[PDB]
Amino acid sequence: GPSVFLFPPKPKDTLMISRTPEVTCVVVDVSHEDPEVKFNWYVDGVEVHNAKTKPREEQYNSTYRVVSVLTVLHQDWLNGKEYKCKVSNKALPAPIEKTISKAKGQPREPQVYTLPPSRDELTKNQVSLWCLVKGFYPSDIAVEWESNGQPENNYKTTPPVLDSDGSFFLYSALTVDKSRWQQGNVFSCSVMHEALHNHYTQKSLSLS
Ligand SMILES: *[C@@H]1O[C@H](CO)[C@@H](O[C@@H]2O[C@H](CO)[C@@H](O[C@@H]3O[C@H](CO[C@H]4O[C@H](CO)[C@@H](O)[C@H](O)[C@@H]4O[C@@H]4O[C@H](CO)[C@@H](O[C@@H]5O[C@H](CO)[C@H](O)[C@H](O)[C@H]5O)[C@H](O)[C@H]4NC(C)=O)[C@@H](O)[C@H](O[C@H]4O[C@H](CO)[C@@H](O)[C@H](O)[C@@H]4O)[C@@H]3O)[C@H](O)[C@H]2NC(C)=O)[C@H](O)[C@H]1NC(C)=O
C-alpha cells in the first residue's frame, strides 16, 4: 500500500527571514487505481487549513508521488511546536498519522571572531577575511557577509564540524580586492542561529 514520510524544513530556512520554512508530507506507492490523497494538518493538535496541495507526479514504477506542504512560522518551529500530517487513501484501512518537531537538546550560543587578512595575503591583489564561529549547538546555522548595506558573495564557509565538548564550529572566508580593504571599507560577518539574541548577530572588521 501507500507509504508516508514527513520532512522538516531546511535548517537555514528556519533562521533566515528571507526564507519560508516548510514541513513536507510525502506519500509514495500511491496506485493509478486509487490515486486521491486527503491530508489533514494539525499544529499542536489544532487543525489548520493553509496547507498547499501539490500536483501529483508520475513515478516510473506504476505509482504516483503525492505531496502536501505546510508553511511554518520561524518562531513556531524554534519554540518546539509539533506538526502532524494525517493521510487518507482508499487503499489504507485507517489513516496514517506522522508528527515532527525541532530536535531537542540544550542550545548553546555561538561565539564569533573576525580575523583580518594574513601577512602572506598582502603581496597578492586579493585578500581573505575570516569569520570563525564556535561553541554553537545545534549545528543549524546560517552565515552571510555584507558591506555598505549590500551582500558580499565571494565567500566559502565550511560545514559545521563537531568538537569534543559536543558543540560545533566553522569558518567563513570572504575574498575581496585588496584596494577595497586598504580604503578602510567595513566588511561584516552575519550569523543566524537559534541561540543568539534576536537569532542574529553581526561582527565587522576594517583596517586600522
Ligand atoms: C516507486 O518509485 C519511487 C521513486 O522512484 C519510490 O519512492 C521512494 O519510496 C521510499 C519508501 O519505500 C522512500 O524511502 C525513504 O526515503 C527517506 C529519504 O527521502 C529523502 O531522500 C531521498 C534521497 O535519499 C529522496 O528520494 C527523497 O525525495 C527525500 O528527499 C527529501 O525530500 C524532501 C521532501 O521534498 C525535501 O524536503 C523539502 O525540500 C524543500 C527544498 O526543495 C524545502 O527545503 C522543504 O522545507 C523541505 O521540507 C528534502 O530536501 C530531502 N531530504 C532528505 C533528507 O533527503 C528515508 O528517510 C526513509 O528511511 C527512513 O525510514 C525508514 C522507514 O521505512 C527506516 O527503515 C529507515 O531506516 C529510515 O529511518 C526511506 O528510505 C523514498 O524517499 C521514496 N522516493 C521518493 C523520490 O519519493 C517508491 O518506493 C517506488 N516504489 C516501489 C514499490 O519500489
**Which of 36, 68, 101 is where one domain is finished?**
101
The response to whether residue 29 sits with its C-beta less than 6 Å from ligand 1 reads: yes
Does 115 share its domain with 196? yes
Q: Whose CA is nearest to atom 31 of ligand 1?
A: 7
Evaluate whether 188 touches 203 at the Cβ level (below 8 Å). Answer: yes
> Tell me, what amino acid is at 50?
N
What separation in Å is there between the alpha carbon of 176 and the centre of ligand 1?
40
What the block records as the C-alpha cell of 140 is 543549524
For residue 113, what are the domain limits?
102-208
What separation in Å is there between the alpha carbon of 136 and the centre of ligand 1?
29
Please count the other Cβ atoms lying within 10 Å of the Cβ belonging to residue 130. 17
Does 139 share its domain with 97? no
Does 90 share its domain with 67? yes
The response to whether residue 110 sits with its C-beta less than 6 Å from ligand 1 reads: no
Q: Whose CA is nearest to atom 1 of ligand 1?
A: 61
Evaluate whether 3 touches 129 at the Cβ level (below 8 Å). Answer: no
The response to whether residue 69 sits with its C-beta less than 6 Å from ligand 1 reads: no
Of ligand 1's atoms, which has the minimum distance to the CA of residue 65?
79
Does 56 share its domain with 6? yes
Q: Cα(154)–Cα(92) distance, rounded to whole angstroms? A: 51
Q: Cα(192)–Cα(189) distance, rounded to whole angstroms? A: 10
Q: How many angstroms separate the Cα of 75 from the Cα of each of 31, 50, 141? A: 37, 17, 15
Does 34 share its domain with 77? yes
What separation in Å is there between the alpha carbon of 7 and the centre of ligand 1?
9
Does 120 share its domain with 191? yes
CA dihedral sign of residues 71, 73, 76, 80: positive
Q: Cα(67)–Cα(26) distance, rounded to whole angstroms? A: 5
Q: Cα(152)–Cα(177) distance, rounded to whole angstroms? A: 12
Does 96 share its domain with 107? no
Total count of domains within the chain: 2
**Which of 68, 101, 134 is where one domain is finished?**
101
b/e for 64-90, b at 16 or more Cβ within 10 A? bebbbbbebebebbbeeeebbbbbbbe
Going by C-alpha positions, the residue among 11, 35, 10, 3 that lies closest to residue 137 is 11
Does 77 share its domain with 115? no
Q: What resolution in angstrom units was achieved for this structure?
A: 2.3
Of ligand 1's atoms, which has the minimum distance to the CA of residue 26?
34
E strands of the chain, at which residues?
3-7, 22-31, 38-43, 46-48, 52-53, 57-59, 63-71, 83-88, 96-100, 111-115, 126-136, 142-147, 150-152, 155-157, 161-162, 168-177, 187-192, 200-205
The response to whether residue 25 sits with its C-beta less than 6 Å from ligand 1 reads: no
**Which of 101, 118, 136 is where one domain is finished?**
101
Q: Following DSSP, what letter does each residue of 35-80 receive, concatenated?
A: ---EEEEEETTEEE--PEEPPPEEETTTEEEEEEEEE--HHHHHTT
Q: What is the CATH number of the domain that holds 158?
A: 2.60.40.10
Evaluate whether 66 touches 27 at the Cβ level (below 8 Å). Answer: yes
The response to whether residue 24 sits with its C-beta less than 6 Å from ligand 1 reads: yes
Does 120 share its domain with 158? yes
Does 182 share its domain with 158? yes
Does 191 share its domain with 136? yes
Evaluate whether 12 touches 194 at the Cβ level (below 8 Å). Answer: no
Does 107 share its domain with 97? no
Going by C-alpha positions, the residue among 88, 87, 86, 84 that lies closest to residue 100 is 84
**Cis preceding linkage at 11, omega within 30:** no
